[model samples]
Target: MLVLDFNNIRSSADLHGARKGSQCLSDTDCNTRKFCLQPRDEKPFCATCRGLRRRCQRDAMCCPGTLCVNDVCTTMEDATENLYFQSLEHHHHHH
Candidate 1:
């Protein structure tokens, strides 16, 4: 019988969508740009990151320049009053 130890291997596995037999549990279990997912009726597998502005629980789940917030991916910005005033200009309104 051939026994294999996944942890002994230094390289990551090539997993996308679903794998017939997988032992991945978290993002660290996959290579870069990939995340681990365990859906119902399927074993845990690695998949690519989702698009921006989508629901996510970690930064690895979102694209670059965006972060996971409130279970959604959003742009990283300073929403303070100072930033608001900087982007605001004097606009004359006609009555």
Candidate 2:
């Protein structure tokens, strides 16, 4: 079992995404393990743990599609004869 003392958390600043698009003063701006990187001159945005198409060490690193294959984040499936179906217009192109 685990216990937490809410009294220590005073306000919204103590939560994640509370001050969005503010500034990357430190790693505390984003959630745990997420890096704060600035792309341009503006405030930094929390970068993905691992970018798409890149190899992912863990499911959390890969975005919503947690299907990691061959250590790559490009693996996911659909419910059908094929992993992905052909467009109706391209039906003749397949099979």
Candidate 3:
């Protein structure tokens, strides 16, 4: 099995969100991938993952629906669905 340094992990306590715009306190806290999102209606966070766009004031952490995944912020359901879809794709099944 692949060895992992739990004590010296460079990640969070656990994989939070799987994508951006889900919710988070900071970009470093949630590693989002999406940019150009509408940061006005509900969870429109453009405050994750730098270099995705020019520096903008980090928006307040999204509501409880926020989570960090693969160093990105995104909705829990979206993240779970992403995993499921990836799994299906890997299996060559139409997901």
Candidate 4:
């Protein structure tokens, strides 16, 4: 098996992931935009990042638009549309 250069790997960053069957040390090992899962047998290889409502332990383990909340990939509310959503809510208040 090939050895990974963990020194240059940081899970927090968006990097590509290793192909299936490759080895990994942590989510950072997937410096290829993927997360390193861990069952050792079914998770040793770099797997696809988690999505909303999926199991996860860190933000790196989840895909964009989702955050790993309490070991699960939670769907985080978006902020961009809020630019107008703020007004949407303000108007909806209809005092």
Deviating ranges (above 4 Å) for candidate 3: 1-63, 81-95
| Cα lDDT computed for each candidate against the true fold | 0.68, 0.58, 0.45, 0.66
Task: Please estimate how well model 1 matches the true structure, expressed as its whole-model Cα lDDT.
Answer: 0.68
Candidate with the greatest lDDT versus the true structure: 1
TM-score of 1: 0.40
- TM-score against truth, every candidate: 0.40, 0.30, 0.20, 0.39
Tens-place lDDT digits, model 4, residues 1-95: 99876587556757686665557677677776676667745646667856665787667667766777668777766322335434333334554
RMSD of each: 15.9, 17.5, 22.8, 18.4
lDDT of 1 at 51: 57
Cα deviation of 68, candidate 1, in Å: 1.8
lDDT per residue for candidate 3 within 1-95, as digits (tens), equals 98876686566575565654455544444445534344555664444333322333433333334455544556656555434334333445575
Query: Which residue pairs in candidate 1 have backbone atoms (N, alpha carbon, C) closer than 3 angstroms, thus clashing?
Result: none
CA shift of 11, model 4, Å? 45
Sliding window of 10 residues with minimal summed lDDT for model 3? 51-60
Candidate 3 lDDT for residue 37: 40
TM-score quality measure for candidate 4: 0.39
Give the better candidate number (2 or 3) by lDDT: 2
By TM-score rank, best first, the candidates go: 1, 4, 2, 3
